[PDB]
Amino acid sequence: EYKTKVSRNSNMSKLQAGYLFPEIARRRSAHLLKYPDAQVISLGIGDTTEPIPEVITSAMAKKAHELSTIEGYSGYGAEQGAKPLRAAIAKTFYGGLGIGDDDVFVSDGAKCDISRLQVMFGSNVTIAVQDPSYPAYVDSSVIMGQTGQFNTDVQKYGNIEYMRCTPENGFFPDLSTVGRTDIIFFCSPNNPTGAAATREQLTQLVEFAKKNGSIIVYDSAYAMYMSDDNPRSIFEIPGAEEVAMETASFSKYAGFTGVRLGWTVIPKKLLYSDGFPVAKDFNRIICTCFNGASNISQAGALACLTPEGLEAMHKVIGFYKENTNIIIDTFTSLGYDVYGGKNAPYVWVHFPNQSSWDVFAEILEKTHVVTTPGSGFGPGGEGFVRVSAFGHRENILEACRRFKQLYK
Amino acid sequence: EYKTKVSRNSNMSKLQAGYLFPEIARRRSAHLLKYPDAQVISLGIGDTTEPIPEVITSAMAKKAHELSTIEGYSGYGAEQGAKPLRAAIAKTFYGGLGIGDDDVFVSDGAKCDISRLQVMFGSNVTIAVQDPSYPAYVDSSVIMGQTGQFNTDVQKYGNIEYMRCTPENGFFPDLSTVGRTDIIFFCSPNNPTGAAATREQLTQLVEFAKKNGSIIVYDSAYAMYMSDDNPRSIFEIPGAEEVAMETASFSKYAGFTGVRLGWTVIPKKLLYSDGFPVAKDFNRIICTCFNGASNISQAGALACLTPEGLEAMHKVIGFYKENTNIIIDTFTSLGYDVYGGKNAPYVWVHFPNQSSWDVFAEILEKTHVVTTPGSGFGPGGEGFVRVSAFGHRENILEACRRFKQLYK
Ligand SMILES: *Cc1c(COP(=O)(O)O)cnc(C)c1O
CATH class of the missing domain: 3.40.640.10 (Type I PLP-dependent aspartate aminotransferase-like (Major domain))
Structure with a gap:
């Protein structure tokens, strides 16, 4: 079992865990192993749709x-x-x-x-x-x-x-x-x-x-x-x-x-x-x-x-801000404190007293919706979850009706 | 003038003069301010054409x-x-x-x-x-x-x-x-x-x-x-x-x-x-x-x-391999030590008793062909010059008649 004599970069070892996003995607590859037929809606990574x-x-x-x-x-x-x-x-x-x-x-x-x-x-x-x-x-x-x-x-x-x-x-x-x-x-x-x-x-x-x-x-x-x-x-x-x-x-x-x-x-x-x-x-x-x-x-x-290019982008920005208004309304209607949503395509949702990794895991298992836990983003951080508004209109409506079924 | 309090990265001060290809690009612009009507052929930067x-x-x-x-x-x-x-x-x-x-x-x-x-x-x-x-x-x-x-x-x-x-x-x-x-x-x-x-x-x-x-x-x-x-x-x-x-x-x-x-x-x-x-x-x-x-x-x-993909690449590698044989033929017919150009689109020409920067300045001055001085690639390096085989066929041909003119 051979090994070279070059020492790992010691800054690589400092890194606590893997990068937030591939890890989220990991956690969800796993969920589609456990449930091959789940209709998974991803509002985890801010990935334009x-x-x-x-x-x-x-x-x-x-x-x-x-x-x-x-x-x-x-x-x-x-x-x-x-x-x-x-x-x-x-x-x-x-x-x-x-x-x-x-x-x-x-x-x-x-x-x-x-x-x-x-x-x-x-x-x-x-x-x-x-x-x-x-x-x-x-x-x-x-x-x-x-x-x-x-x-x-x-x-x-x-x-x-x-x-x-x-x-x-x-x-x-x-x-x-x-x-x-x-x-x-x-x-x-x-x-x-x-x-x-x-x-x-x-x-x-x-x-x-x-x-x-x-x-x-x-x-x-x-x-x-x-x-x-x-x-x-x-x-x-x-x-x-x-x-x-x-x-x-x-x-x-x-x-x-x-x-x-x-x-x-x-x-x-x-x-x-x-x-x-x-x-x-x-x-x-x-x-x-x-x-x-x-x-x-x-x-x-x-x-x-260009006039056309800028027009086109204004339209797509407008579409996402609508999705985000929909997400804001659903969590507001369900009683949660939500920040963000006005000046960006994602919302920042307070789950007091809970670990954001636990919330993330609950929503994923019960709803088949991917979110991003707050503590992925640093200690301030816990327990918010970021919900991204990049999805087809049907996908956000449906994620939103899932959050509705789930919470009281 | 206002200045921040952060020090320059000491690894950038280590560096120097100031990246070779910009350095050749300068001398090329300098050259053209000198010869406005000049037909400059570049056998310098290894760049596909x-x-x-x-x-x-x-x-x-x-x-x-x-x-x-x-x-x-x-x-x-x-x-x-x-x-x-x-x-x-x-x-x-x-x-x-x-x-x-x-x-x-x-x-x-x-x-x-x-x-x-x-x-x-x-x-x-x-x-x-x-x-x-x-x-x-x-x-x-x-x-x-x-x-x-x-x-x-x-x-x-x-x-x-x-x-x-x-x-x-x-x-x-x-x-x-x-x-x-x-x-x-x-x-x-x-x-x-x-x-x-x-x-x-x-x-x-x-x-x-x-x-x-x-x-x-x-x-x-x-x-x-x-x-x-x-x-x-x-x-x-x-x-x-x-x-x-x-x-x-x-x-x-x-x-x-x-x-x-x-x-x-x-x-x-x-x-x-x-x-x-x-x-x-x-x-x-x-x-x-x-x-x-x-x-x-x-x-x-x-x-x-894919077969067509690979077919296409072979035909282009072949074009440039034919360019490079022509470069070798001509330096060789002229008496020089010429290395490479068998397994690569580069010929490595020995110009002993000269610095490569001068051979470069000489070639550039007097033929309007840009080469790469061997010294830009390190001390060992000195004194070869590198001639690239990437250009249009006519350009290579023309640069080659121009080398013969120039040499003994
Ligand atoms: C051209 C070249 C490469 C490829 O560089 P890219 O960033 O892919 O263009 C790598 N190594 C050497 C020595 C080269 O000449």
Whole structure:
């Protein structure tokens, strides 16, 4: 029984358990083993369910055809992203906010941007996250050697600042009790709570980062579901250009979850403590560690940033916000406290006194509905469950009538 | 100017000057500011130039049309890649070599595979690479914390074993001179040299990884260009499954360079010194730090692994193999030592008593042909130049009459 002499990466061993999502999918592969005929409805992973609009798919199909012509054939392409696409993103999403074409970095998706940022920052930085938050920030940090071990008494990795975002503080932390770090990851609208920060809130966030000499990594993945009058971008806060970057994705807006495109914006005025432009480093990482987003997907996102493309996406965003209103109403009618739902395609449901893993297991077994337990998302966390609103209309109506049968 | 309080990642300051291909791209733009009317032919960056075979692009297109239907809409994940694709890759390139479906991890390409591997390994391993070798292994190693500083005397980074590969050893390390490392990056058919390890050399390498307790990262990106009767996979060497993983790309066979599809194979018996399965850590990385190759790229890759697919790839590999014989004929008829171009789309031309940067500057200046100086690939390296065989036939032909003009 042979073994090499290379030691496992000790940051891999720190990881408490497997990644939240494959584990949920694991738990559900198991349920369809126990019950091969169960009509399983999945509102677990925020996985878009509608076709991509024909305006996007034609662009992609035509790009594929053109690769078989001498004149349409491209090859390797700027790994920063096609220039017309960087421009279109700058203008569409950041026009009037001080961002140029050269500040946008197109990628194969935000999960990949996140880990690209993390290799760039290195393992000598400390980080803060919202609690609860999206598990890829915490997990990438452990992986990169930014942390200590996991403490099972608090449910926290050591050396990470966890910023409690609760129903009682509007899901915004009390920044007077948050310890300085190098990096602050901020998701708005938040996954899993659905909370979108206010102009005044983000104002404080910028001031805080500016006082502590921190970088904010702002995740606007969901910002197109905004209903309230709140910034969609951090760069709307004057002074964000000296302390902030933004990551986003086409997945939620265009349904590109299997299709794969995002970007990150690093402004010319984000500098490390020696004056070295942070953008200059991310560019160096992108050239050595990534090979550029797919040219078919880039033609895709290009067609998105057009009157028709934007119309198409508004429609699909409207469909999901309806599903979410339906989910909100069902749990409200059943007597539960539900947050989120206004500014994001998922709802955040309080089950007081119960473990969220237990709730998840109950709903799954009795209803054949997949949800996501809150403590998948950090210690603040327990016992909320995130219910996602990405399903066909019939599927959400039926999941909803299941939750109705189940609860009193 | 305002500056944050976070320090630059010291692994990025280690790096330097500033990635080779940008460096050549500059000198190419500089050159054209000098010769505005100049007909510049690029035999530089190894980049595919023929259209993707129709049978591929049709598959990719049809996939794109399908994302706009209820039936054929997808969504996320299985970031390991789709089952049928992993199956087809296992069967087609590793049939008979003990490799299961589950050992194959589909990625969006070989540069992103080295990223993910290097993060899985962590900052604490040491690495051996061939000298000259493809920059991505070296630069990614620096980025990850694996080296010390660059030494301008010898032109190498501290803490890397550079395994020299020269005319005098027929471009294979003399392994009894090679110090132990944790990882050995090994590319055959090699880039830049075009040299493909023999069955007896690869057996020597595995036996060396076995006694040193090392991991081989075998790079078969050019394996489909093999002409000599040499193993195309490391897994052809009995015992490789205990000490080797393999990394490949569709970029150089279907011209996927701008489309983006690769894979990495990790056998079941590859373990760390504590008995832990390397593949498991890899699966954890790909799950948390990547979101999968594109569904459209996967559909393309699947169309390749079919009789028509394979027929198409052979015809393109053949086109470029004919380009490369013409390059060899011409340098050889001109008196030089010319290496590779038998098992690879690269010729390795010896220009003794000159620096490769000057031969490059000379060729570029006086013929309007871009090459790649051998020194961009490491000290061993000096002074060859690499000539790529990817371009249109007329372009290769024209560059070749231009070489004759130029030489003695
Ligand atoms: C082209 C090439 C690869 C493939 O890179 P992709 O990211 O798939 O394009 C890998 N290794 C070497 C040495 C190469 O030349």
